[PDB]
Scaffold this active site. Structure first.
Site, mmCIF file in Angstrom:
data_model
loop_
_atom_site.group_PDB
_atom_site.id
_atom_site.type_symbol
_atom_site.label_atom_id
_atom_site.label_comp_id
_atom_site.label_asym_id
_atom_site.label_seq_id
_atom_site.Cartn_x
_atom_site.Cartn_y
_atom_site.Cartn_z
ATOM 1 N N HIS A 1 -6.902 -6.750 -0.428
ATOM 2 C CA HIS A 1 -5.782 -5.826 -0.471
ATOM 3 C C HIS A 1 -4.688 -6.190 0.527
ATOM 4 O O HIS A 1 -3.503 -5.932 0.273
ATOM 5 C CB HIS A 1 -6.324 -4.430 -0.204
ATOM 6 C CG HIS A 1 -5.277 -3.372 -0.158
ATOM 7 N ND1 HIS A 1 -4.444 -3.110 -1.222
ATOM 8 C CD2 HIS A 1 -4.955 -2.481 0.806
ATOM 9 C CE1 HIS A 1 -3.642 -2.110 -0.907
ATOM 10 N NE2 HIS A 1 -3.937 -1.708 0.315
ATOM 11 N N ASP B 1 0.861 -1.197 0.000
ATOM 12 C CA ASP B 1 0.000 0.000 0.000
ATOM 13 C C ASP B 1 0.892 1.241 0.000
ATOM 14 O O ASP B 1 1.806 1.307 -0.836
ATOM 15 C CB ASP B 1 -0.972 -0.110 1.167
ATOM 16 C CG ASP B 1 -2.059 0.926 1.103
ATOM 17 O OD1 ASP B 1 -3.042 0.687 0.385
ATOM 18 O OD2 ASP B 1 -1.906 1.985 1.738
#
EC number: 3.8.1.3
Lengths: 298, 298
Positions: B277, B107
């Protein structure tokens, strides 16, 4: 304790099949419906409606779910807050007044209601004015980094409930004032009448109202876009004579002129910039009123 | 707060831009692990132990995140640009004697990582980026669908204090909403509850939230600008790199990630992982195996 910003105007609760529309009604002459947008109520017309009321019966309506209008129960598709459904509800409201053929000026969400109305039921309209919008399709099709940052709220408010509802509840007063200020040319609340801001603030203080506004933007990201898309692909153009006004520093404005956009959407469109931010009727009421009076006068 | 890295040391590493907190464990070649939003270093707690059998694992809080110091931002969000965070992490690794190290980022931390690899490739032995495409690519593919998927890219980039004020009403709600919404399962079941506590506590701090928005502001502006320069100059990461992404993660939407990364990296291999994610928490085995295999090879 809200101020009456339309002295002489009457106050009408118009029954529709989906709930009441609240309207201020004044003037005499051909009917002219005025539709506000986000995050406002009908009172946003308070500086221009008297000028329009010189020549028209001015109906200053709260959108379905906005202001003092009833809030229809929404559904998974946000149907009542799609512009198609709001247009149908306002057509019904106007019929309750015996107005089946009327002039329409809309700002922001109300302008989206208005061009959708013109696409779905152009026979209902003598003339259309849209203030500081491009069609919803055009915003979504032009979506890019710069527009995504500028109208972040189109994607933020379209998030599934209760994410925007919960975040909006974190500081609703700040949010509605931040929207009002940040979309003016001035960058503060100085263009607004403080009594109008209080109307907007009280409306926005109600979480059920805020949820409706999210329903509106969720509609704006889905069904409204789909409806618009069907028209673009069928080449359907608004036949209603149309005025497109935009703020020189408003949302719709960019390099390519908003008039050039609307010309793909309307067969008979004239336009002009108003030295204004987004809130044309409050930041530039004289220029806005004259533009509408001149265009609508027939 | 739970110790999720039993046997890992704790280091507060001084840099010119504030202290970097890191858990440190293992032995062997240095491997820096960088978390992203809205997480802290502890998101590595399930894969770093396996990594620490083969590597000296440095699990750092990003500048401004977790227990790292929060350099005051500026109008360009400079310290929270990935360029600056990379330079600060280079400094921090230099404090430990690691002038050449392996780097895995997730991320925001993966955004620091590939920026590090563009700015100072000589510092990296190999690079792993978890479930990201370059910031430029997210913005370049920000159409209607992607603007709705990663609305937070534009929401959190709004000028202070707008997102900070909305986030402050119920910070727990937002951090949990984000952790849940980006997983495969759509809830918090993939996360160690003690890890969620770390994330929630970090997010409870208004200054920490502000830094997160600053991160996203840099992401919408300076980071994009720095990326834009490199893509338009044809600058490619020359560091052997692994791109991992969740089959249900953020990167896989908007583009096929390996195709995108090949434009950015001269030596890139890719592997999807069945995960949302949060690869190292949703798929710790598969993530740790991919990282170990990649970093142990050449």
């Amino acid at each position: 304790d809200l101020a009456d910003l339309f002295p002489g105007f009457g106050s009408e609760w118009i029954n529709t099949s989906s709930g009441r529309i609240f309207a201020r009604v004044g003037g005499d002459g051909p009917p002219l419906l005025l539709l506000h947008g986000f995050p406002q109520t009908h009172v946003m017309w308070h500086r221009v409606a008297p000028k329009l009321a010189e020549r028209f019966k001015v109906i200053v309506a709260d959108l379905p779910g906005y202001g003092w209008s009833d809030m229809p129960e929404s559904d998974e598709q946000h149907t009542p807050y799609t512009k198609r459904a709001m247009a149908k509800q306002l057509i019904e409201a106007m019929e309750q007044l015996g107005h089946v053929h009327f002039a329409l000026a809309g700002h922001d969400r109300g302008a989206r209601v208005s061009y959708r109305l013109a696409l779905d039921s152009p026979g209902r309209l003598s003339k259309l004015a849209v203030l500081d919008i491009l069609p919803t399709y055009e915003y979504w099709q032009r979506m890019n980094r710069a527009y995504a940052l500028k109208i972040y709220h189109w994607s933020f408010l379209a998030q599934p409930a209760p994410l925007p509802e919960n975040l909006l509840g974190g500081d609703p007063d700040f949010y509605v004032k931040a929207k009002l200020a940040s979309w003016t040319r001035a960058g503060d609340l100085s263009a607004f009448d403080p009594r109008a801001v209080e109307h907007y603030r009280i409306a926005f203080a109600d979480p059920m109202r805020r949820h409706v506004m999210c329903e509106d933007y969720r509609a704006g990201a889905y069904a409204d876009f789909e409806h618009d898309k069907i028209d673009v692909e069928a080449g359907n153009k608004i036949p209603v004579p149309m005025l497109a006004l935009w703020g020189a520093s408003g949302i719709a404005q960019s390099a390519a002129t908003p008039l050039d956009v609307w010309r793909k959407w309307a067969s008979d469109v004239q336009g002009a910039p108003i030295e204004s931010g987004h809130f044309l009727p409050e930041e530039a009421p004289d220029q806005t009123a004259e533009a509408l009076v001149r265009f609508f006068s027939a």
